[PDB]
């Protein structure tokens, strides 16, 4: 893995102690391409962009789960036919990209063959299986925006359309310069910290 251990201390100061090195790099294995398409540059870029996002979803990975319980009841998409079995309000954003709706526990657990969809505590519970779910959505997922994060990063679209495709929605087109910029700036410095370039069009 292009980020060592003493890098993820380094990266990570405050975490909770629930997010593992170990834990990342057993996650690896699901997403082979990642962090290992392209150049040496590239893989570094990649790697940063994807933990600077993390970093930004969880504060600097100190929660697990998402922090306004208020929220917890609204992501149950009812329409689904296999409905939301685990409770209306046991979807709420989990692990490092805040994995959050029953429609994505089950996509991702489809994808992952773990059942996310009748587990979803797993995702707060072990540390490998939360940094698998943060590699599926980076992977394979467009969220919002119009490419993975993967495909950003290895194409070289840059690092702003990470953060369109990763809850950046409301932060985006001028929504919250001030979110966007410490975005950047946590890129600037993982890149920084890894001894790459951070590449163009960082922002959105
Ligand atoms: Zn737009
Ligand atoms: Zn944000």
């Known amino acids: 893995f292009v980020v060592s251990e003493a890098q993820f ?17 057993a996650a690896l294995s699901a997403y082979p391409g990642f962090s290992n398409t392209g150049s040496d540059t590239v893989k570094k870029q990649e790697a ?17 789960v998402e922090q306004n319980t208020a929220n917890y009841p609204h992501y149950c998409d009812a329409s689904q036919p296999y409905g939301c079995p685990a409770g209306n309000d046991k ?23 773990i059942d996310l969809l009748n587990n979803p505590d797993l995702v707060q519970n072990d540390s490998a299986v939360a940094w698998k779910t943060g590699l599926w959505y980076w992977n394979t997922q467009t969220g919002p925006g119009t490419m993975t994060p993967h495909d950003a990063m290895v194409n070289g679209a840059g690092f702003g359309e990470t953060i ?3 809850n950046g929605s409301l932060e985006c087109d ?4 001030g979110q966007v910029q410490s975005r950047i700036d946590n890129y600037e410095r993982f890149t920084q910290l890894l001894g790459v370039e951070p590449g163009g069009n960082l922002s959105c």
């Open 9 to 25: 201390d380094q990266m990570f100061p405050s975490r909770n102690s629930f997010y593992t090195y170990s834990g990342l790099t």
């Open 91 to 113: 979807y709420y954003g989990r692990g490092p990209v805040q994995l959050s709706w029953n429609f994505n526990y089950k996509a991702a657990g489809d994808a992952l063959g």
């Open 48 to 64: 940063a962009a994807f933990l600077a996002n993390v970093g930004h979803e969880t504060g600097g990975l100190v929660y697990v």
């Open 164 to 166: 369109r495709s990763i």
């Open 174 to 177: 001028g929504g919250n310069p």
